[PDB]
Amino acid sequence: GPQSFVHFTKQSLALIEQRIAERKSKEPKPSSDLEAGKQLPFIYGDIPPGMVSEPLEDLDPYYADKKTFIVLNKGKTIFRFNATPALYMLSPFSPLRRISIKILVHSLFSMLIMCTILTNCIFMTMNNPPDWTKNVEYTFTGIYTFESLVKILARGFCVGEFTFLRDPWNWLDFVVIVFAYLTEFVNNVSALRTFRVLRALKTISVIPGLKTIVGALIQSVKKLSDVMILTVFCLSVFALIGLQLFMGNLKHKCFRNSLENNETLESIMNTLESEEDFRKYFYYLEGSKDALLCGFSTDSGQCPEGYTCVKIGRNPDYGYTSFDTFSWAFLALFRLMTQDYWENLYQQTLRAAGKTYMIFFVVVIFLGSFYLINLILAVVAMAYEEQNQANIEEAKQKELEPYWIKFKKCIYFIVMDPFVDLAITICIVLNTLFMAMEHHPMTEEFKNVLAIGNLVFTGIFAAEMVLKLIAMDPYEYFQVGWNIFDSLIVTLSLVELFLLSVLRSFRLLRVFKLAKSWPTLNMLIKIIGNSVGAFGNLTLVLAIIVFIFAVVGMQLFGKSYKECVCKINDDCTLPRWHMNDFFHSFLIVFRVLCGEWIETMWDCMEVAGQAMCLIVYMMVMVIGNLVVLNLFLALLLSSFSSDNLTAIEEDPDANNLQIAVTRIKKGINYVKQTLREFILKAFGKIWWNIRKTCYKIVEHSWFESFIVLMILLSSGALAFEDIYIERKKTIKIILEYADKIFTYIFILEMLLKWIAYGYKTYFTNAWCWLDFLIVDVSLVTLVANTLGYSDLGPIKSLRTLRALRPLRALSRFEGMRVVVNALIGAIPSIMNVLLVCLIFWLIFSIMGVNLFAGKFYECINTTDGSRFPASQVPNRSECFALMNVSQNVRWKNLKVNFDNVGLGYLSLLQVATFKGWTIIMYAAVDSVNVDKQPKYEYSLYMYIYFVVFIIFGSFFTLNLFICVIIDNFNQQKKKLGGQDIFMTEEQKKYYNAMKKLGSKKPQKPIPRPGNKIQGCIFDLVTNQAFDISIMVLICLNMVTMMVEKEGQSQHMTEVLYWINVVFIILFTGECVLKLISLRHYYFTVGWNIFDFVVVIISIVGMFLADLIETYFVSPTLFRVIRLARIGRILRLVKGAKGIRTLLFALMMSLPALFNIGLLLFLVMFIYAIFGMSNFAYVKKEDGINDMFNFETFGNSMICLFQITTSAGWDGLLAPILNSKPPDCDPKKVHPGSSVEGDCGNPSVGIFYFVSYIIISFLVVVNMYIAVILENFSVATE
Amino acid sequence: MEVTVPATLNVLNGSDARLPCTFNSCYTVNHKQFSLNWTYQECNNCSEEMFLQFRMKIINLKLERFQDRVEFSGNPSKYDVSVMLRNVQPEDEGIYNCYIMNPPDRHRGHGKIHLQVLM
Amino acid sequence: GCVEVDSETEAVYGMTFKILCISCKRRSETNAETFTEWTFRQKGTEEFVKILRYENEVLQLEEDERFEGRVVWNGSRGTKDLQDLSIFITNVTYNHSGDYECHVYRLLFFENYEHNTSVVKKIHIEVVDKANRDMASIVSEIMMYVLIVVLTIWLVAEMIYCYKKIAAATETA
Ligand SMILES: *[C@@H]1O[C@H](CO)[C@@H](O[C@@H]2O[C@H](CO)[C@@H](O)[C@H](O)[C@H]2NC(C)=O)[C@H](O)[C@H]1NC(C)=O
């Protein structure tokens, strides 16, 4: 009804209740389109003018029977009400109620209540409000109170379907105003103040379109039920394992053996309170809070001579890193799963209980910190996608339902499309590369050249702006969106010229002007614009959440961090990362979002209570991470296919570079012919039998097996060559002679292949080229060895290429071949994405080197490492005048900094990875000017550089990479038929078969044995409650395993032993009765097999454990055999179904990750040998110490496994860059060996670690893809 | 270190006077540094006088007119350093001071109490 | 880093010999101050006699007419944290065959107290007229050649067998 608008009058009141009167005298869903909040449809057209914002008749047929009315805005918005008097007082024509509606149905109302809130927040941002802010507080309270009031006497308190209190979001305004009145009248208050924070959550109510956003987040969380259950379960199981193994281990410290005046461990340990007191009796490395660990084994930490390894004291890191009680094990393994500074746990456990406990930390990082995270990112994605899909479907369905003129035209013909634009772009690239040549120790001449260049370029760009501005009118000139940009840039240039350092660097964004001829940069601009465009509300939500958590953290913990600073920092001054300001609170919340959430949490707890710190941090992390994952996913899927679908042609107005390039092939090809025409115008069977033999032999599986075994022996033989080789002299001789034999066999290999396949086919295959190069290396090395040229420079740096010997393995292992082909098919694309990322990071790097370059120098008292305070010695000359009279003073940089664009790229690689960025921010935000001693946070507001950087380079670039990888993989899968690209042909059979195990629904129900007694046993076991009970008692046993702690008591140990015995007895009994029931059928059920096995292992374990402890002595074997019990828990999996399917997905996916694991192991082997050869003699520093280093194959594989997750790689890399003393010493003696010098080579070191981190990143991306596609395949099935 | 004290104290003559000095220090009070300085002064012009303290153990200097009437009646571990005034007279009417230093917290606490006697 | 490698046990006559004695420390970062004594029991005598003492930069040689000018110090230099204590013999004789002990006394420096430990290394020395080649080296060399030759004959045997087979098949074709 387009023209059915009737003022809701006395007759409306009159008519309605006799309708409802006959309904109650005689005793369909409402129009979704017309339901309030949305917009009025176009079917009713326009509204009579005076009828707007008035009580109107009800349109929806469903509500037509009942007694309501609707009021419509000038913005065509539906506001429905109920015609019952408000509080039985305000009838629909009471004059107060009319004007109340007029306010409520008015946009300026929202504008006011929003302009108040967005200033209330800015008032929240202050930690110590001045006395004048009481007035503001009171006025704010008044505005909220009466703006809620205008709701009440219009909407209605509680007597209606539509009445105020009904909407959940009008709960919050009510509660805040009543609490504000309360606290104002009951007059610590910090908890009450936290609810004033709650005000700024009305933001979500006021601005439209976030109601839907938060609804979406809620419905998307609703799906992560079973994954969170399984995360809790798996974390708990590994927590039990870690509890059993390491209970009390991290409490080891080295205690002096020479105590004077009759004391003991106990006698001291009762009377000790200091760090100094603990230093006089334990072993503390220089500059550390915790006591050095130690272990009772040969593969553990070694106490200094004079100390003995004892278990006493407090656990490390204030006492919070432990495996002592179930809860602390949960905390430690959650820290492992989120990989938050897990490498310190890695080193602490290894130093405590030994290196051979590396297997534990491997099984978890592979499973816990990968398989859970993927299951989460896959579930969230899968949800999101369903909603985007339904949304798109719905949107679609709904849509479906005189002289001036002379020279201006002259200049316009001098717009010449093919060429002037190319001149400008080459000017752009020449500028950017000219501005990438700053550096700190830059001479005055370079300074001059750079300045002059900047000036010439500025001039050219400006000239083209003014020329085209006179060319065509500003009315259209300022319509082209790129035009506004250029004008802006020229204006900025002029302002810079006539006056900050940051202002020098807005001439950089011209690099985007190449995006016209650059399609991948167009993709990137599509992401950047999208995040402020069609998904800008979700980014606003992220901003809101960060604000809320920032201010809550400040309100709760702010004072604490100031009364209790001495607990967390020795100098009685606030730490670096604290919650006493709004800005620093924001920084800590940002850091929690990036993923480094313990250390701040330890400080938090140490000053302000474990419970409130824990609840906040866990909540911050979860909520934030969820919202960020949702943003990432959205952008990725929008940009994936929903961004554009090639609706328009490739550069519809053919690209000016493509117009230009035609004039090039017009030029180059024609002129190529003009110089061409002018220059011509001016001027027997036996050999084939040998071939077929050699062909036949090399194909034979005996030969191939021989060569594979040969390759494995070479690979292994490489690993013996370490630092300790001079000790094992016989092995030294054997290895030389075996290497000689090996090269012999391998050249015979070459000769047979050459004659078999022929030179051609052998030279046109990649693997044969690889082997050819390798055996060439071997041959040259051998000959030079036998000719005495065995020590002359490069022929010793050529030997270190023996480490490439394993690279022959890839050509023999199928899985390795299939992974290599899959990863090589996607390099072409990855290269374009990488190059965009590089130019972008180059813009950031020039911003950096302009802001910071040359200012990280600082005097350092090298004995302790404390920079001299800027009260005395504020500058260079002072640092030198100090060294000449004092000592151990140096003007020392950071070695990874911004002194030029290259080191800039390096330091940015550190920041974007969060592994070592902390020292860069610290030494940057301290900066003053070149040749100046820094001051503590003297430039505090440089952290925003890092925040912006972090945001773009880690968040958008990661998105871009992931998008391209997925796209290519889709290509690499779709083209071949859906085949998994990580599985060999036999692996495919296995997978297909393993799939049919997950598809069998029915089985015969085990006919019932005849005899009455066993029949009763049968109908007992097959009853539903039997299993329910058994799993209840399984949980009752799991808790019996949880209740243990550290040093509990003698009595408790026995009493738990006895409960354990009773459970064991019941379980064994169930098993026996079950067997009796399904006689001879027990084994038809794989789960029952598992069960038999566990019962048996468990009985065995109890008995064996008893035996060993009683007669033998073996603590470690005792603990490792008491782990048989853990199997009893794994039967929780039986009853579940939300977990079985997920673990069956992991079982499905296993072989692919097997092949990537093989490739990763081979790469780790090669890099291990490389490290063994080069960095076995570097100094011992940040990451390289007495236990984690490259001196041996075990140590090097430990270090590389650690940085496979990219963890702590800056720490290892830092002691390799040192060179040219005083950083190192090149004339060290190194007893027991002839090598000299103790510092490494920067270039090879940088190559080593950078190369490794990209390759590790690429293989783990492949692992991600494998598990994620497996989950999609299982879930949609 | 905030100090929680009643600014004005009226106690009946001859009765018992509870003079509460308390603080909230986040650091565990340890007797090997924590110090209590118990002083009193009558008129602002007239001089401050010390009667109790705490260096290692509770020290009472047993002053004239403060003799055998003051003993420590609180325990520093639970942040309570209250003292009692036995059988108050008109004389002790004046302004009472409790100075607290609780290392390692640097800020030196200070409570002030006005004691008045009613006939 | 530091590796404790045992000394070689044969010396050729009328030549140079270095008697290796490395004594690492348990933790590499500590700080010590060490000096070393060497005693030497000749083959046939039953008592060990002090021969040389090294303290802080100076080797003090005992007045023994078998080591007048034939030993010069050759371990770690320029420090007091001696960790490689090898000596060098510059002119070997037949009186140098006997039994040795490398007495290293290490006084450590810690946060509040000092340790006086002790380590002893025992070396047996046989002087000879010409250098005998190590048994493992000889066996390894002959093994290298014997595997080389057996692999050659294995391969050629397969070449002849496959040649006969394919040739026969070709005549038949
Ligand atoms: C550099 O730091 C060292 C070590 O902290 C300072 O050396 C201390 O000097 C004072 C007297 O100036 C001595 O009482 C301390 O015992 C010294 N410390 C140690 C560990 O021995 C040195 O003063 C600092 N350098 C300067 C001159 O600022």
Ligand SMILES: *[C@@H]1O[C@H](CO)[C@@H](O[C@@H]2O[C@H](CO)[C@@H](O)[C@H](O)[C@H]2NC(C)=O)[C@H](O)[C@H]1NC(C)=O
């Ligand atoms: C370097 O630091 C000194 C710090 O003292 C600056 O001040 C000079 O200090 C010297 C030594 O005390 C005095 O003799 C000079 O008179 C001080 N300067 C002035 C202007 O009075 C000094 O200016 C700094 N110079 C630079 C280039 O940083």
Ligand SMILES: *[C@@H]1O[C@H](CO)[C@@H](O)[C@H](O)[C@H]1NC(C)=O
């Ligand atoms: C044990 O302590 C007593 C102090 O009562 C002391 O006299 C005695 O020397 C001590 N014994 C030893 C062996 O130190």
Ligand SMILES: *[C@@H]1O[C@H](CO)[C@@H](O)[C@H](O)[C@H]1NC(C)=O
């Ligand atoms: C250091 O400066 C002082 C002050 O002039 C001077 O006496 C001394 O010789 C200088 N030392 C060196 C090594 O330049």
Ligand SMILES: *[C@@H]1O[C@H](CO)[C@@H](O)[C@H](O)[C@H]1NC(C)=O
């Ligand atoms: C060792 O000394 C003897 C006697 O001086 C001398 O004949 C002999 O040549 C010397 N041999 C060597 C290798 O110095």
Ligand SMILES: *[C@@H]1O[C@H](CO)[C@@H](O)[C@H](O)[C@H]1NC(C)=O
């Ligand atoms: C070697 O020893 C014999 C006796 O044992 C002695 O007569 C002779 O002089 C010694 N020679 C040297 C070179 O010390």
Ligand SMILES: *[C@@H]1O[C@H](CO)[C@@H](O)[C@H](O)[C@H]1NC(C)=O
């Ligand atoms: C060892 O002895 C020889 C012989 O004089 C000498 O040249 C060398 O410097 C000594 N030290 C080392 C480390 O070789």
Ligand SMILES: *[C@@H]1O[C@H](CO)[C@@H](O)[C@H](O)[C@H]1NC(C)=O
């Ligand atoms: C260390 O022990 C040796 C062994 O006798 C002794 O000669 C030396 O004086 C001792 N040094 C100290 C400082 O105790």
